[PDB]
Symmetry: D3
């Protein structure tokens, strides 16, 4: 407080995509199940990190300066939820795309 | 299978702990109360965030343009309650949650 | 500051997930459903267990001699739903929780 | 695959922390000790509760009619230690857990 | 107030789940078993890491130069067990834990 | 797997130091207690992240190539434990110093 960094969300969302990518490589049901367990945990951790930035780091001036930020954060969380439900790495990548947009705004607010 | 009652019950616990902190200034008790209040407020925030991210959909945010900011204020109110002993901060959090609850059940109709 | 509604809500998710499992045989969906069910049943169990350990007091147990066994039955009902895809097991857990809910509010009056 | 030793170990930490609290009045140390105690007692309670819900079965409860109340007493003993700095409260919890340990291993023979 | 028994009991749960996975290939059961095995192995690893970081001291690492690598191998064995259904991987983890336990109790003398 | 980054440990250890620094600014017992609660959680999260890198990311060749790494990781965890017990920001900073040493080795292993 107020030491926050979207790197946490990003790293956990990379785990999600990485796991998705491995699920194409190994049809072993045990492996598929473990991958699914891990992916569920990591996506939910990524969502917590995104949510925390939104509620705890970003403040009223940030939301006036970036009117799009509320919806962007909601979209990010929903993208992470869709990645959670999926084996398709494109869904993981979409969540990473959104997180990158949060990250860009974040580092701007550190400047002014 | 979402119900704002989960956020409510947790925020009610926050407020009840604040009230109890006013009636006993034993430092051990004060510390225990602070510990319990910190966890309850974070659980409440989790539950609120989950409604916002997982239950509410773009049609709802269209119909209720103030919803995004309401949820953010609610989470910020819960953080303020977390950092305070004043039961009125717990009550403000509950007030915000009641407004979410109103909208939530309106979308269930 | 307790409410068996917390247990109920979680047990309701258990049943809901069981129902979803009948309509979609995709292995990944079945796996995720199973993962989610496991967590939700254990959360419901935690809520039930806490009521029993922290809310209910000696006077309640003397007034309700069946309550120890009711709560244990509830927990085993939830474990049974955890290990099953049959929504009837989810409903049975809900039925037991409902019996705890009634007793709870009688003690609050 | 259960063992009341898990509950014991956690309850032992509770008592140990209570003892440390007598020899060091630094507020920060007292606060940390209180934080740690709270967690450890709740872990011990979780372990005790799981035994009761998941390990003990109807035959055990008929064979040991006092077991429901023994376990509930144990949990309240742990809650009492959680809310106290007196090592005697920690020891009382350990004593109850020891009674559960004996019953447990009788059921395993 | 450390005891390698916590790591052991958790790794014993890993092995018992692996054995049980060999006796029933129902996919729902297999998934549940995988979920439970994943949590147990991580708890075991947590407990092992805690002994290494919080209990063992520089004099111990001097007296037992192989201890650092033993602990790392133990954690790696537990990860291997986590990723496998072979009960022999669970047993290798327990074997490593038994070597830590031997050293641990030697340092208590 | 194998997507790991010592940034996670570092960010949580920065939280620890930041909290330590705030405890000098406000003598309110409630505030001191909250600071203590948060500091305990964040330090233990930092320790998990350090431990995970050591057990899950680093492999036998890394430990032969860096014979000091086992002890360095143990020192890092103990430093985080000492920071956990303390209000002195210097203890937080020491844990960050150690984490930086892990981070340097880490990014070398990503190159070869």
């Amino acid at each position: 407080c107020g030491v926050y960094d979207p790197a946490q969300a990003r790293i956990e969302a990379e785990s999600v995509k990485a796991v998705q990518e491995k699920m194409a490589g190994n049809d072993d049901p045990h492996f598929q199940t473990r991958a699914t367990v891990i992916k569920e945990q990591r996506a939910e951790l990524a969502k917590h990190h995104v949510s925390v930035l939104w509620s705890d780091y970003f403040k009223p001036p940030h939301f006036e300066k970036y009117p799009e930020l509320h919806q962007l954060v909601n979209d990010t969380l929903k993208a992470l939820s869709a990645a959670k439900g999926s084996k398709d790495p494109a869904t993981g990548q979409k969540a990473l795309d959104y997180i990158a947009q949060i990250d860009k705004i974040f580092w701007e607010t550190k400047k002014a």
